[PDB]
Amino acid sequence: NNQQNY
Amino acid sequence: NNQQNY
Amino acid sequence: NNQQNY
Amino acid sequence: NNQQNY
Amino acid sequence: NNQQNY
Amino acid sequence: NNQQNY
Amino acid sequence: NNQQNY
Amino acid sequence: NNQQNY
Amino acid sequence: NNQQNY
Amino acid sequence: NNQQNY
Amino acid sequence: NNQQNY
Amino acid sequence: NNQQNY
Amino acid sequence: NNQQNY
Amino acid sequence: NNQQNY
Amino acid sequence: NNQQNY
Amino acid sequence: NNQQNY
Amino acid sequence: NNQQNY
Amino acid sequence: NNQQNY
């Protein structure tokens, strides 16, 4: 699974 | 699963 | 599943 | 499933 | 299923 | 199914 | 099914 | 089925 | 606007 | 706007 | 906006 | 915005 | 925004 | 924003 | 932001 | 931000 | 930030 | 699993 917070 | 927060 | 928040 | 919030 | 919020 | 909110 | 809100 | 709201 | 598909 | 697919 | 896929 | 896939 | 995949 | 994959 | 993978 | 992988 | 891998 | 906080 993937979570990206820019 | 994928979540991206720009 | 995919969620993108621009 | 897909949800995109521009 | 697809939901797009511009 | 499809829902698009411009 | 399809719903489009311009 | 189709519903379009311009 | 409302669309319901039973 | 609302779309429900039963 | 709301989309529900049962 | 809300999308629920049961 | 909310996406739930049961 | 919230994404839940059961 | 929140992502939960059960 | 939060990511939980059960 | 938090990541938990059970 | 992947979490990136920019």
From Swiss-Prot, chains A, B, C, D, E, F, G, H, I, J, K, L, M, N, O, P, Q, R:
Transmembrane segments: none
Subcellular location: Cytoplasm
Residues making up the signal peptide according to the UniProt record: none
Taxonomic superkingdom: Eukaryota
Other facts: [PSI+] is the prion form of SUP35. [PSI+] is the result of a conformational change of the cellular SUP35 protein that becomes self-propagating and infectious. This conformational change generates a form of SUP35 that assembles into amyloid fibrils. [PSI+]-aggregates sequester soluble SUP35, resulting in defects in faithful translation termination by read-through of translation termination codons. [PSI+] can be cured by GdnHCl and by deletion of the molecular chaperone HSP104, which is required for [PSI+] propagation. Present with 78900 molecules/cell in log phase SD medium.
Written domain comment of the UniProt record: The prion domain (PrD) is a Gln/Asn (Q/N)-rich domain, which is unstructured in its native, soluble form, and which forms a parallel in-register beta-sheet in its amyloid form.
Family membership noted in the UniProt record: Belongs to the TRAFAC class translation factor GTPase superfamily. Classic translation factor GTPase family. ERF3 subfamily.
Oligomeric form and interacting partners: Heterodimer of two subunits, one of which binds GTP. Interacts with polyadenylate-binding protein PAB1, and TPA1.
Chain's role: GTPase component of the eRF1-eRF3-GTP ternary complex, a ternary complex that mediates translation termination in response to the termination codons UAA, UAG and UGA. SUP35/eRF3 mediates SUP45/eRF1 delivery to stop codons: The eRF1-eRF3-GTP complex binds to a stop codon in the ribosomal A-site. GTP hydrolysis by SUP35/eRF3 induces a conformational change that leads to its dissociation, permitting SUP45/eRF1 to accommodate fully in the A-site. Recruited by polyadenylate-binding protein PAB1 to poly(A)-tails of mRNAs.
Descriptive protein name: Eukaryotic peptide chain release factor GTP-binding subunit
Native species: Saccharomyces cerevisiae (strain ATCC 204508 / S288c) (Baker's yeast)
Gene: SUP35
